[PDB]
Structures are given as structure tokens and as C-alpha cells.
Amino acid sequence: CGWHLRDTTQVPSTMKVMILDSGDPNGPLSRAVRNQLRLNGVELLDKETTRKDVPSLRLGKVSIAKDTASVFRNGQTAEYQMIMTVNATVLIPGRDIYPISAKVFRSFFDNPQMALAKDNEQDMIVKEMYDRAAEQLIRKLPSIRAADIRSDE
Amino acid sequence: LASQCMLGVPSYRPTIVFVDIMSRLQADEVQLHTVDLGNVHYDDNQVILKGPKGWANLNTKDTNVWEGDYQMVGRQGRGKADLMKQRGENRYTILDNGSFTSCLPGSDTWSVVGSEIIHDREEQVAEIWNARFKVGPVPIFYSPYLQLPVGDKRRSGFLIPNAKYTTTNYFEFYLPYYWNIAPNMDATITPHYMHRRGNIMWENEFRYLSQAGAGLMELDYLPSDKVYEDEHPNDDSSRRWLFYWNHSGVMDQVWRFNVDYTKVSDPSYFNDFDNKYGSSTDGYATQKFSVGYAVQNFNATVSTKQFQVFSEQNTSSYSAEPQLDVNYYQNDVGPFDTRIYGQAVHFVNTRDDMPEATRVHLEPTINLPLSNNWGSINTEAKLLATHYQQTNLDWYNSRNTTKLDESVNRVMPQFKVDGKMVFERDMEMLAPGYTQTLEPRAQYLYVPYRDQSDIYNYDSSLLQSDYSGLFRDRTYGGLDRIASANQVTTGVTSRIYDDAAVERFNISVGQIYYFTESRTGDDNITWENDDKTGSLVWAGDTYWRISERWGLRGGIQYDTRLDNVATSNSSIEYRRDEDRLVQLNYRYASPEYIQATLPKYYSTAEQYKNGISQVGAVASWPIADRWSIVGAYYYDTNANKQADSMLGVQYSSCCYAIRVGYERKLNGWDNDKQHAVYDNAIGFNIELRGLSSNYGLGTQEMLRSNILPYQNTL
Amino acid sequence: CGLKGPLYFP
């Protein structure tokens, strides 16, 4: 075998209490990141807390773009590709910042005679992209703890 | 290039008939009383002045220099004057019979000459009276006034024009006028001459910033059109127009405002006019408005969704007029977490004789997440309670054997269990300190059958089953179709992490096993096989971050009901700068997948019938330090014909830049001959430089000009 | 000649 069950938590032990900050705290990335942090057992402090020893995750610019990725032989869109990019940063007290990002790709076929249905399919897809962005930001936290330890060494 | 430009620019230091005097002055002779000869050199925060003769007042810092030459300090400009003056405590540098350029010394590519020039350093402007603009020794242009912006402050007036030649409109010319309305809003009015149509389209852009958010409006208007008037001679007039509005913002952290609105005069508008917002690639214009309130545990959104469809093949389009969405959340209900989704909507049609409906939907959800270091399990339960009242049914129930019903109730329990593990392994085979991760998932989903054939499908398209798609609770995007489910999705991801704990690679594979046929009662689906149960759907995904500059992605979907790979895509990219990259990409979608998922006539019409098998290549590269070459090529491998080709060359200098862009694209079909139609465009752009903060090499703008635009896949 | 740029709050 050689494999074993994962020993360490997905989120570093030094990040299990942290501050979450956003310019849009009620938005869909903020909700996806709240949910992904809480599912990993993180407790989240308010931005206005008296604590100064805890790390903080700041959610920066989100972009989404929808582009024609394929065309039919008359030059009309066969497929749209949607790309979501999220920039974020983790600030560690007494130490430097660690910038991080997520990037997500999804594609779907267009249909002009079901345009309302395809707009609801697009709202469905963008909601899932925020969840994959929140997962990617969480999976980068072990690299920040490794860079933190490396900087101390 | 920015370093090669600043290498040609002077840089600023932190007393004395007589020479070196302190602003600083030097000469072979000075008479002091004011001061008056030979090798006169003057330097300060923003200018050098040089000449045979000079004068200054030491109390006011007023100055005159005759027959001199000048250079700016820390900024790129230079020139000469017959009399050069400083006035208003160094605000004004004034030039009798003067000249100006941003060109580096001795490299006279272009200049402005005037009977008077005033540089004003507070207003960031050079003003010229009897201006003549020169390229080399030749005066191209003259006017009684001219103004150049010699900084970064926004200003009203004409922008540098641009031109193109298109097969669609012949010669085209654009002369933008910019209006600086306020700090937070502006307009641009651009006459667009087109030689084939023989008339000017007036293109009006307005931009704004507000408490409610930021947005852009565009109104393009053409009073008559000699091309359209020959193809459509029956109408009142050949007026062509586009209106566009985009808005987005969040106010007080709680109020969300969005607009995404386009309307055009006719179906043909975007095939005729290359435009900043729509495309010849698009089969409809979208018309959306929404207002939301959102807080940590709750949100509610009111919206309308309307679409203008261009094709004649079916004229029916549905709108939501309006839709209301509501969400409420409550965590830690004992061990459970809770959410409620509610929706209310009215469906309206463009045809007078199609069905219309009101729908209400309510969806309380309760769930129990349980979690360890090595794995987790999540259980959900829901009701999918829905009510319709349907209207205008006489026409539809006269044509169809299955009949729509005036009132419908649909109530369904949904049950789901979603379970995940993680395993880890130390590697010695790749490198020391590398680690492998392995992540199996299993999900069970149950939804019971309800016959939905008495409900018209207003809002539900069939969804596409990518690797994340394997774990959805829905087959359809809306609420008019909800298929039965009795299925186990299984899948596995593996990841490789380096010694710095960064993810270098991942691959994911999975399948959906169906224990019973997934039905709606209005299924009607034209698959290749009668297969209804077993391991029917497969999907896979991979990403390799080969280095900080190399990246590879791929995805595949296989469906046993098509007996073929349904869709696939892959791409490899090298990227080093913004200006240096190479990307290869491939996209596939089978003839069987078009037949299954799209309108019935796509299987019969040769321009849709064959699916997609598209190779794309994109590159950007700097040649020497001063040329940017950008290019893209896209090829239909089933046709053996081009889809799109683009080629952009920019020459970039300290004094100016020139860009030539070529595009050849698919732009319709000839019904008299059964072949594709192509449009060619050649565009010419020219730009003064060294006057403002812009030294960019133009690559990323060219890469997004074409109908299949660049996305960075690293 | 004019000059276009970003919008900002006064």
C-alpha cells in the first residue's frame, strides 16, 4: 500500500481561528468562503475584534468572463466558456502577507430558442464556480504555513 | 522600452558684471542689477533652457531666453523657440514662434509648431495658436487653435481617430469626441463613417460611478442605410440602432443592483456592425434587470429576464416578468444546518398564442455534516414543493395529444448522502519531500417520479455533466423539469504536492450509476441507445502546473447513451510575460451530442449537424524591444476550413506607436449555395507617446479582439 | 485634443 489516511487537518493548526474580510461580506464568494472555512472547523472572528494574534484572510477582486469558446460553421456560438478568477491574501501577525488566487473554468452549449432556460443554467454554473474558488483558496493554506515556517528558518 | 525612453530624459541637486548662480543659471557673462550672455544654461524642477542670450527677475522668478532650445526634466518633451519665457512663478512656459515634441533628442519623428505655444504646468496642457502638426519635415495638418494634454488629467475634446477597411462596409473612419462631464462620469460621441452605406452612424457612450455602483450605456444610431434598404425595401425606413446598458454595484454592503441590457433595431445588426459589446457569434440580445437585498443569514432578489432572438427559425421566446428569489439560512439548529429557498415567477411569451404561467416554488432543506481530519459525510433532505397556474392554453391543447392543465401541484422529497475520504503518501520516485494525495467520493441521490408533462417547459435546459457536474442534484437548469433520481455517483481525484506544499498536478475520474431510469414524463430524448440503467455517464478532468510558465488542462465527457465521447477539451500553454505566450487548444463535441441536447433541426442543417472539432493556436511575442506580434488561428477539422484567424502587429516607440490588426472570421451562411460567408477586416491605429503614463506593448488588447478571444490557462 | 481615463469619486 504505502498510502495512509490523512493525518493533519486541511487547514493549518495555526489558522483554526482567523478573521475573514471582504469589501462585499454578504456576496456569493464571501458565503462560499464562510461555508468552506466552517466545514473545515475554522471559527471566524469579526473584522472589528480585539484579537491581534490571529491570522486574517482577505478576499480581493473577483472577475467572471463569458466568451465564445467554439463556433458553428455559420460563425455563431456553439459553446460559451466561463472563467472565474479570485485574488485573495493571508496576513500573518508580526510577519509578511501571502497573496493567493483561485481560477475556475466551466463551459456550456448555447441555445437561442431556450434563452431563458440557458440564462438560468448560467446562474446555476456561476454559483458552482464560487464553491470551486472557495475550495482552491482553502487548499492553498498549507502552502502559506510552509512559506511562513520557511521564512522563520 | 520604458527604460530606453527614460534614458533620453534629464533628471534633477537638493549665490553667485560677472558663471554659476542659484533654480540654477549658468553663463559666460552675467550683468546683475534683475540679471542679463553666452552659453546661457538654466535648470529647475521641470525644464532645462539653453541659448545665446537670457534675462530674469530675482524677486518674481520671471525669465526670458532668446533663440533658445529646451528640454523637460523627469518628463519626455523638448523643442525650440525664437523667444522662450517663464511666467506666473513657473506655472507657464511660453514659446513665441515655438515648437514641441515628445521625441528623444535628434530623433525628430513628429513635432507641433505654432505662432505661440503655452505650456501650463498646473492645468497639464500645451496650448498652440496657429498650430501646424509635422511628420518629419512635412506639415500634415493646421488649425487656428490646438491643445495637447501633456500629463494624465482628463480633458474634453477629440481623441486620435482610427480607420479600418472591411469587406462588409468598405472604408470606415472613427472620430471620437470625449466629454469630461465630472470626476465620476463622462461621455464619448463618435461619428463612424462607412463608405458602402454612405452615411454616418453616431455612436454615443456614457459612463458613470455612483453610490449604487458603476455602469456604462451605449447608443449607436444610423439614420438610414443604403445596404439594408436594398435587402429590406418593405419597411418605413432603414434606421439601424443599438442600445446597451450595463450596471453593477453593492450599496451599503446590502443593496445589490445589476443591469445587463442590449436591444437592437433588427436581427442582422451584429453581422453588419462590429461592436464593443455584442458579436456576430450571438443568436440573441439579453435584457436583464435585478435588485437584491442581502445580509449574512438572508437575501431576496427581484428581477426581469427578457431576450430578443435574431433567428427566424422559431419566433417564440419566454421571459421572466418578474422573477423573485428568496434565501434564508440558519446554522447550528442542534446538530443540523438549515436553509430555505423560495421563488415566485410569471412567464410571458413574445407570441400572442403561446401558454403563459405563474409559478411558486418552496424548498426547505435540512442537513447534517460530520467531519474528521481524513474524511467527511454529509446528509441532506428537502421538499421540492411547486405550484403552477397556467393560462392561454387553447392553442397548445388544440395541437398536442398530451394537454397542459390550468392548475398543477408538484411535491417531491429529495434525499442525498455525500461522502469523501483523503489518503496521503510520501514519494521517493519523483523528488525528495513530494507528497501524493488520493480523494475518493461517493454520493447517493434519491428523487421520486412525478409526471410533469402537463407543465410547459418555460425555463429548464438539460445540464452538461463535467467532473463537478457528476455530483449535482439536478439534470436540468430550471424548475419546469426535475427528473427522478436513484443513483450512485462515484469518483476519485489524485493530487501531487511539491516539497513547498504547492499543488503541481491533479487528475479526476468518475461515473454516475443509475439504478432506475431518470424520468420527467416529458422526456422525448433522441439518444443513440435504449440504455436506461447502469454506469451511463463518465467524466474526467486534469490540470498540470508543469512549471511557473508551463500549464496543461484537459477534460472529457463520455456518455454510453451516445456510444461516443460527448464533449472534450484540452489546452497547453507557455506564458512568460504579458507579452510572451503560446497556447494550443482543442475542443470537441460529437454529432450525437448535438442531436441529443440542441433543437431538432440542428441534426439536419449542415452548419450545425457535424458538431465541433476545433483546433486553436494563439501566440504573442516581442520581436526586438519595439515590435509586438500577436496571432490566433482556429480550424474546423471536420470541415477542413478556418473558423477564425487574427494577426496583430504593433510598432512601439518613445515618440509614437502604430498598430495594424487583421481579422478573418465566419460571418453567416449562404442559403442559395450551402457554404459559409467570411468577413475580412484590416484596422489601423496610431498613438502619440511620452505625453502621459502609457508605455504598454499592446499585446493583451490584440489577443481579445477576435471572435474566439484569449483566456489565460496557466 | 482630449484625454480619456478612469472615473473616480469627487
CB B235 within 8 A of CB B262: no
- Residue indicated by cell numbers 450509476: B513
Beta bridge partners of B665: B644, B679
Q: Report chain B residues whose CB lies below 8 A from the CB of A139.
A: 503
- Residue indicated by cell numbers 455563431: A76
Q: Is residue B129 part of a domain?
A: yes
Q: Search chain A and give the residue with CA nearest B283.
A: A112
What is d(CA B325, CA B327) in angstroms, rounded to the nearest whole number? 7
Query: What CATH number is given to the structural domain containing B73?
Result: 2.60.450.10
From residue A49, alpha-carbon distances to A26, A41, A52, A54, B648 in Å are 18, 19, 8, 10, 53
CA neighbor of B146 nearest in space, from B135, B157, B137: B157
Please provide the DSSP assignment of B360-425 as one string: EEEEEEEEEEEE-SSEEEEEEEEE-EEEEEEE--HHHHHH-SS---SEEEE--EEEEEEEEE-EEE
CB A78 within 8 A of CB B612: yes
Q: Which residues contact B116 (CB under 8 A, 6 or more apart)?
A: B94, B95, B96, B97, B98, B128, B129, B130
Of A38, A121, A128, the CB nearest to B468: A128
CB B99 within 8 A of CB B117: yes
Environment class of residue B277 by beta-carbon count within 10 Å: exposed (0-12), middle (13-18) or buried (19+)?
middle
Q: Which domain holds residue B15?
A: 2-152
How many independent structural domains does chain B possess? 1
Q: Report chain B residues whose CB lies below 8 A from the CB of A40.
A: 371
B272: DSSP letter: H
Q: Is residue A88 part of a domain?
A: yes
CB B323 within 8 A of CB B459: no
What is d(CA B255, CA B435) in angstroms, rounded to the nearest whole number? 46
What is d(CA B566, CA A109) in angstroms, rounded to the nearest whole number? 12
Gaps in chain B with C–N over 2.5 Å, residue before each: 12, 14, 16, 18, 22, 33, 36
- The CA angle B454-B459-B462, to the nearest 5 degrees, is 95
The gap between the terminal CA atoms of chain B, to the nearest Å, is 26
CA neighbor of B271 nearest in space, from B688, B690, B572, B676: B676
- What are chain B's partners, defined as 3 or more CB pairs within 8 angstroms? A, C
Rg of chain A's alpha carbons, rounded to an integer?
Answer: 19
Of B320, B375, B463, the CB nearest to A121: B463
Q: Is residue A83 part of a domain?
A: yes
Of B159, B177, B209, the CB nearest to C7: B209
Q: Are B154 and C3 in contact (CB < 8 Å)?
A: yes
Pairing verdict, β B185-194 and B170-174:
antiparallel
Q: B660 in helix, strand or coil?
A: strand
Environment class of residue B525 by beta-carbon count within 10 Å: exposed (0-12), middle (13-18) or buried (19+)?
exposed
Q: Which residues contact B191 (CB under 8 A, 6 or more apart)?
A: B174, B175, B200, B201, B202, B203
Q: Search chain B and give the residue with CA nearest A111.
A: B598
CA neighbor of B36 nearest in space, from B53, B21, B49: B53
Pairing verdict, β A17-22 and A43-45:
parallel
Burial A23-39 (b: 16+ CB within 10 A, else e): eebbbbbbbbbbbbbeb
Burial B466-502 (b: 16+ CB within 10 A, else e): bbbbbbbebbbbbbbbbbbbbbebebebbbbbbeebe
Phi then psi for residue B590, to 5 deg, are -75, 160
CB B305 within 8 A of CB B343: no
Torsion of CA B57, B61, B67, B70, to 10 degrees: 160
- Residue indicated by cell numbers 491605429: B685
What is d(CA A104, CA A136) in angstroms, rounded to the nearest whole number? 9
What nine digits make up the cell of B228? 439594408
Rg of chain B's alpha carbons, rounded to an integer?
Answer: 34
Q: What is the 3-state secondary structure (H, E, C) of A38-55?
A: HHCCCEEECCCCCCCCCC
Q: Is residue B49 part of a domain?
A: yes
Pairing verdict, β B550-559 and B564-575:
antiparallel
CA neighbor of B227 nearest in space, from B308, B163, B166, B278: B166
How many independent structural domains does chain A possess? 1
Q: Do chains A and B touch (3 or more CB pairs under 8 A)?
A: yes
Q: A146 in helix, strand or coil?
A: helix
Phi then psi for residue B651, to 5 deg, are -95, 125
Q: Search chain B and give the residue with CA nearest A122.
A: B477
Q: Is residue B500 part of a domain?
A: no
CB B693 within 8 A of CB B75: no
Q: Do chains A and C touch (3 or more CB pairs under 8 A)?
A: no
Q: Is residue B82 part of a domain?
A: yes
Burial B41-53 (b: 16+ CB within 10 A, else e): bbbbeebbbbbee
CB A131 within 8 A of CB A31: no
Q: A113 in helix, strand or coil?
A: helix
Sign of CA dihedral B224, B227, B230, B232: negative
Q: Is residue B587 part of a domain?
A: no
Resolution (A): 2.5
Burial A116-128 (b: 16+ CB within 10 A, else e): bbbbbbbebbbeb
CA neighbor of A60 nearest in space, from A15, A90, A40: A90
What nine digits make up the cell of B689? 507617446
Q: Is residue B550 part of a domain?
A: no
Q: Report chain A residues whose CB lies below 8 A from the CB of B254.
A: 26
CB A83 within 8 A of CB A65: yes
Q: Is residue A4 part of a domain?
A: no
A128: DSSP letter: H
What is d(CA B217, CA B189) in angstroms, rounded to the nearest whole number? 12
B469: DSSP letter: G
Q: Search chain B and give the residue with CA nearest A22.
A: B253
Phi then psi for residue B698, to 5 deg, are 75, 5
Q: Search chain A and give the residue with CA nearest B293.
A: A26
H helix count then E strand count, chain A: 3, 6
- The CA angle B598-B602-B606, to the nearest 5 degrees, is 150
What is d(CA B240, CA B234) in angstroms, rounded to the nearest whole number? 15
**Candidates B281, B286, B303, partner chain A, best to mutate (most A CBs within 10 A):** B281
In the A/B pair of chains, how many CB contacts fall below 8 A?
198
What is d(CA B269, CA B433) in angstroms, rounded to the nearest whole number? 59
Query: What CATH number is given to the structural domain containing A146?
Result: 3.30.160.150
What nine digits make up the cell of B365? 432543506
In one letter, which amino acid is B268? S
Q: Which domain holds residue A22?
A: 13-152
**Candidates B206, B209, B276, partner chain C, best to mutate (most C CBs within 10 A):** B209
Neighbours of B670 (CB within 10 A): 10
